[PDB]
């Protein structure tokens, strides 16, 4: 099974960042993920390529359109790796 | 092979008996650790006026 997916799952709870193919970055508490990176977040900001920020409550995001997901540095320490 | 068989035939049980000057009838008996200082003096505690004997 996908180790990045696993990592993402683990990160559940944390304040993750999230950019799409469109280039619109989000940053907030990760709620839920799946095998395909079907992310959900809570209490999340949303900045476009221009730079104008927009706050929002509950966002769901589809893994296909997701570019990359930034997790906090805490999960580097442990423990799903080895 | 049943461990529960040794109920009140444990070493611990024996020790307790010895301490309390109380023979489990099957098992051994010893000189009491402590001399039975019979000096209750008919107190209001542990009296036969007070306790029940069911």
């Amino acid at each position: 099974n996908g180790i990045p997916v696993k990592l993402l799952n683990e990160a559940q709870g944390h304040i993750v960042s999230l950019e799409l193919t469109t280039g619109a970055t989000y940053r907030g508490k990760l709620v839920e993920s799946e095998d395909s990176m079907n992310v959900q977040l809570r209490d999340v900001i949303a900045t476009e390529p221009q730079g104008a920020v927009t706050h929002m409550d509950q966002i769901f995001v589809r893994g296909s359109q997701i570019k990359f997901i930034v997790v906090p540095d805490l999960l580097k320490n442990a423990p799903l790796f080895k | 092979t049943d461990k529960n068989y040794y109920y009140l035939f444990d070493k611990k049980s024996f020790f307790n008996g010895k301490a309390l000057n109380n023979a489990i009838p099957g098992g051994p008996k010893f000189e009491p650790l402590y001399p039975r200082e019979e000096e209750e003096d008919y107190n209001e505690f542990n009296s036969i006026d007070r306790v029940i004997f069911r």
Partner: protein, 268 residues
């Protein structure tokens, strides 16, 4: 424990206990009173041992034999056990005679069975000279016991007595130490040992003669033997202080002893 596993450290034949288990168990019902009493006694003996844990020497690696080996004066062979026993009997006998002769009393004659007794009737001075004490007598008793077990094995070796018979003889010796030869006279804590042996006999015989009837021919000397071995352990020390002391005296006999007023007598 014993069979649960399929690997282990080896215990000494001494350090196995085959009687123990029975007495630990609740006694089998419809036994006589005496047997029950014996069982109880055994339990008590066990329990006391358990209770007071005698934790052994941290320091002392140097056992007696090792030290001896480290000298040039001992050398070592492999010997038949009966032969060894015989040697012990002879050597022991020699020792007791030699010591006795040194003491001057040549009129107390040792049997080769170790029963010491006097040749004539001793005059009073002679008697005074020649009263051996609790050390020497104990040693003699021990030697006698050894001879008895060794003697039985010798007999067995010779065509004189069957293997079963030999076993039975051994068992008898170990139980009857008390009657067979006075140790108890000289050291009356051997009485405990004797009692233990008796108890074992009572237990063992009742186990062994269940469907089978009353009679002589019960072997199974092991627990009795073990008991005697353990008794001997205690003695080793006591005898080494006692017998050793005596021999020291014989070579170099005390200068200025100090009496002690903690005695009831002489205090006032």
């Amino acid at each position: 424990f014993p069979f649960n596993r399929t690997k282990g450290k080896m215990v000494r034949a001494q350090d196995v206990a085959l009687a123990k288990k029975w007495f630990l168990q609740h006694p089998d019902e419809e036994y006589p009173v005496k047997v029950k009493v014996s069982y109880q006694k055994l339990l008590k003996n066990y329990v006391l041992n358990e209770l007071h844990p005698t934790l052994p020497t941290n320091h002392n690696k140097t056992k007696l034999l090792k030290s001896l080996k480290n000298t040039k004066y001992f050398q070592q062979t492999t010997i038949d056990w009966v032969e060894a026993g015989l040697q012990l009997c002879r050597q022991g006998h020699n020792m007791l005679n030699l010591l006795i002769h040194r003491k001057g009393l040549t009129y107390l004659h040792l049997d080769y069975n170790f029963n010491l007794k006097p040749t004539k009737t001793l005059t009073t001075k002679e008697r005074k000279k020649s009263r051996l004490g609790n050390s020497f007598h104990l040693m003699r008793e021990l030697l006698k016991m050894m001879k008895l077990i060794v003697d039985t094995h010798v007999q067995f070796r010779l065509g004189n007595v069957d293997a079963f018979q030999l076993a039975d003889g051994i068992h008898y010796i170990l139980n009857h130490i008390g009657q067979l030869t006075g140790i108890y006279r000289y050291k009356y804590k051997v009485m405990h040992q004797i009692r233990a042996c008796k108890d074992l006999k009572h237990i063992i015989y009742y186990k062994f003669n269940k469907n089978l009837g009353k009679g002589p021919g019960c072997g199974f000397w092991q627990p009795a033997w073990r008991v005697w071995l353990n008794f001997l352990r205690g003695t080793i020390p006591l005898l080494e202080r006692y017998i050793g002391n005596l021999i020291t005296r014989q070579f170099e006999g005390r200068s200025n002893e100090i009496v002690k007023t903690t005695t009831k007598q002489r205090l006032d």
